[PDB]
Amino acid sequence: AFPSGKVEGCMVQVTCGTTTLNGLWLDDVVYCPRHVICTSEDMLNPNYEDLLIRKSNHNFLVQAGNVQLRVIGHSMQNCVLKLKVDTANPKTPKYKFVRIQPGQTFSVLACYNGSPSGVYQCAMRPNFTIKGSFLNGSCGSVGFNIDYDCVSFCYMHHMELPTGVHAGTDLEGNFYGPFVDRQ
């Protein structure tokens, strides 16, 4: 797998109500799966536009380790929520966002509640899923490749499907495969 040090410094925890998951902090934006704004009932047929208008910046609790970051804006880009915070990450690496395809390998930094747990090499199967228990409970973890000094982020985990495999999006919030973020 690729060394994970440059990506470890970007992982944060995002909490909205009773849901907590991982987010990616680059410059002064935190990226995370938009279903963080859903309750359990909401996930069956969520109306994300209506849910978002009722959320204020203070409903999002973002923690980088022991430090709380203040959210000063929020917007949706396809299936990813973008939280503007009032502090740029001083550990932001050189990066770009890329969309990949099945069979292309990448490394995933699996985190629990914003804390790095392991780094693993994987690839999506031809049906755009990942099989592998290293993503269990790791919603919002990201996948990346490293090219010299530049991190290419290519994947964000959004959900575990009923069959025990994992689905996710690119960092523009577009799903890989024919999946939607609802149960």
Domain spans of the chain, in order of start:
11-85, 93-169
Residue linked to tokens 């755009």: 128
Q: Which residues contact 172 (CB under 8 A, 6 or more apart)?
A: 77, 78, 80, 97, 99
The CATH number of 93-169 is 2.40.10.10
Task: Name the experimental technique.
Answer: X-ray
CATH 2.40.10.10 is the classification of domain 11-85: yes
User: 29, 85 in Cβ contact below 8 A?
Assistant: yes
Distance CA 63, CA 25 (A): 10
Identical fold for domains 11-85 and 93-169, yes or no, is yes
Give me the torsion for CA of 158, 161, 166, 169, rounded to 10°: -40
Q: Annotated active-site positions, please?
A: 35, 139
Give the experimental resolution in Å: 1.8
Distance CA 129, CA 29 (A): 27
